[PDB]
Design a binder for this molecule. Sequence first.
Ligand SMILES: *[C@@H]1O[C@H](CO)[C@@H](O[C@@H]2O[C@H](CO)[C@@H](O[C@@H]3O[C@H](CO[C@H]4O[C@H](CO)[C@@H](O)[C@H](O)[C@@H]4O)[C@@H](O)[C@H](O[C@H]4O[C@H](CO)[C@@H](O)[C@H](O)[C@@H]4O)[C@@H]3O)[C@H](O)[C@H]2NC(C)=O)[C@H](O)[C@H]1NC(C)=O
Ligand SMILES: *[C@@H]1O[C@H](CO)[C@@H](O[C@@H]2O[C@H](CO)[C@@H](O)[C@H](O)[C@H]2NC(C)=O)[C@H](O)[C@H]1NC(C)=O
Length: 815
Amino acid sequence: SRLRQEDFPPRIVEHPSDVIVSKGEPTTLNCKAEGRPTPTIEWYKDGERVETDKDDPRSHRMLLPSGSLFFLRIVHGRRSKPDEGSYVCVARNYLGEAVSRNASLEVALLRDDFRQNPTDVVVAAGEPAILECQPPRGHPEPTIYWKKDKVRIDDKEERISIRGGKLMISNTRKSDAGMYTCVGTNMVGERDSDPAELTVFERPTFLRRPINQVVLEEEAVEFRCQVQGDPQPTVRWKKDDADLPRGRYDIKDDYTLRIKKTMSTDEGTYMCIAENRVGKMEASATLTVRAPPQFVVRPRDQIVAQGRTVTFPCETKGNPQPAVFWQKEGSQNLLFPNQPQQPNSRCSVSPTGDLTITNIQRSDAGYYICQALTVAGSILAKAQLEVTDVLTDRPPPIILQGPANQTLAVDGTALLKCKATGDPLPVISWLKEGFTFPGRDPRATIQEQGTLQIKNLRISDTGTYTCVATSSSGETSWSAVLDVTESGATISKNYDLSDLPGPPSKPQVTDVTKNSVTLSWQPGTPGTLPASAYIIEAFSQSVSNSWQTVANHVKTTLYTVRGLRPNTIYLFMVRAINPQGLSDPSPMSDPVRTQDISPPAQGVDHRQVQKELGDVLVRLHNPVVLTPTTVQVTWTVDRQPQFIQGYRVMYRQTSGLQATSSWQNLDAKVPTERSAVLVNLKKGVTYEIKVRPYFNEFQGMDSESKTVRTTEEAPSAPPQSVTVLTVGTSISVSWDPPPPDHQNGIIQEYKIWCLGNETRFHINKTVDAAIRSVIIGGLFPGIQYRVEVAASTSAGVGVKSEPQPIIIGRRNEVV
Ligand SMILES: *[C@@H]1O[C@H](CO)[C@@H](O[C@@H]2O[C@H](CO)[C@@H](O[C@@H]3O[C@H](CO[C@H]4O[C@H](CO)[C@@H](O)[C@H](O)[C@@H]4O)[C@@H](O)[C@H](O[C@H]4O[C@H](CO)[C@@H](O)[C@H](O)[C@@H]4O)[C@@H]3O)[C@H](O)[C@H]2NC(C)=O)[C@H](O)[C@H]1NC(C)=O
Ligand SMILES: *[C@@H]1O[C@H](CO)[C@@H](O[C@@H]2O[C@H](CO)[C@@H](O)[C@H](O)[C@H]2NC(C)=O)[C@H](O)[C@H]1NC(C)=O
């Protein structure tokens, strides 16, 4: 109470501010006041007076010189909380008081259980992974970071970036797999989260890939395939994108695929497919099967008569399918199937491979050879053709049925039959036990119809009688034994007319060697009793002049007649034996010669025909254009070798729409060709020409390329649809692109004519191709003109389009 006009009541200059601080740690509540006299400061938490170290030297709080309340260590418990509250500093003197603002001191907090614990994540290498986390509640609010396997991880990246609660890695690798914890700190401390693991699976990868293999039929083959990935991928096989037709395939545990028995049909592109959670991956390999060519049917020799038709079969199997082609021994020319010739030759080859010659000439006779040639090898077989004329040789006369063993009583009259055939027609003669008959005795005489007649029988006439047919073509004989006794004409089996089984099937040749020929025939049976066995007669212009037996008592219908003269032609005849006697003779066999087949042999090697076709140099001259739709191409050969089917000539478009694309293919199927005319091509356009000599599936080397363009033709249809804008005086011209084919060449220019109301003034403007729309210059005022656009070419004169007699106005307007 010492008044002075220098003394002023107290003013708090520095106010204490709210603070959160941790237990057991120092802190200072800031306070600073002005006064005169200087004031005494004292603090109040909620209401009560704060006991500093002045009020008791045992206390932990301390009022500073400044006035700030400084705690040494903050004190806090569960029940007694002495420092947690709402502080205010109060400075006073005799003039008055001064209470500060509120400042609350709060003890720091940090719970255990997280608001959101990071959860396990599964990703595929290269993909982004997002881990999220939310720390426990705290005061202050906590802030998080991430540990990988108890190692801090920095966002010092563009792939790694921590944002809010979220952590993300992009382009994940297996480096990133492991335990991830999210750690939330504070000024209390830090709590770790439940660990979330990141698994980084990857797509399947090939360790051992299957490799292409080439293998001969019926062998065994396998393709290996080893994979890797996370998770472990499952392997499966497919062929040509289809599943493997069950059978010879076998899937091993190590995933190897084994084909036990290889087959032309097993060929293809096999592929190994690996698949897990992340997706799939496939790698293929090819299998190729080599089947060397082999004859299914091979041609055998034929003896056939002039003017007929011959067919030599040649069927051929292999891989690739072999191409059949023929050649006449001692002749350079070859014959190929689909190839046509002029309607003047009679040779011709089936797609099957069968060779056929119509209307045979003596000229055609000789050996022929069908040949097969692939990369898998080569084969051939030759067969002989023998042609026969009007009657190069006629067969010797034939006795159908001769006399049978008659047995007649004395004094009677005996007739003996004998049935002949042949060309020329035969003379029938007789013999008795060998000598001439009838000789001297008048009682016996020779009949025309083969029968021999004896009036007035006697004992003296019993014997062996022989019927002999004779022409210029040979002679055959048939003898029987006659018996003449007094009584003996005992009715054992009287005379037979047509009781005898009728002829059998004309004998069909099967196999033939040098001393064998196998025959086939079927029964006949137009007769009486059943046949027991067979008897084969035969003939040869060489070995004999008459018909001989070559096997008797044959109990089959497919017999091999053994032991014959080699390189000899033979004809045959079959008969049936039965108790009644013998059958009539079957018709003659078809001529056959005794030779051993020329067994299949190896042809020329594929490499060596390749080598020949390679060295062939086709010189092309220069394409000569016929019309703008036609070019005749002419080449020449250095030296044409034996093995060549023809020339394959190829051209490509190198102008306008779709240039330098594929080649148009058309080939000359006849090797002696030297010229070819192309069809339906584009006028004006330039084309590149290549000539290649080709064999079968085989191909030679290309000739020097020539390029030549078609002669150019003016268009057939111009662009239409003429539009006229209004000026504001001068007419306008506008058109739509004219058609591609109707262009008839490369567009040159565009000509506009204006022969309108003025028939002694026509406007002429000559632009270029690129031009689309243009306005006309010097136009006569008022006068109504006509507009006629034209497409043009390098020919010149184009084609007029849609006329437009549009009405024009005056000057600088259209009225
Ligand atoms: C007019 O008269 C003549 C004159 O004899 C008679 O022709 C004789 O016919 C027989 C046919 O059997 C021939 O002799 C005998 O051939 C036997 C074959 O047996 C098979 O034939 C029967 C009947 O078809 C079958 O069913 C059976 O399965 C047999 O397979 C052979 O086994 C005998 O031949 C013997 O010949 C001599 C002996 O002379 C021996 O060296 C041999 O080893 C063998 O044993 C059997 O004798 C006979 O060849 C014909 N005679 C002659 C010599 O010309 C007919 O009655 C009639 N004409 C005709 C043309 O048949
Ligand atoms: C400081 O602390 C109080 C809380 O104890 C604050 O809240 C005020 O409460 C009083 C009643 O005690 C009210 O009259 C006010 O309206 C509240 N304040 C405002 C404006 O928010 C207040 O900030 C301070 N109180 C004092 C000393 O006036």
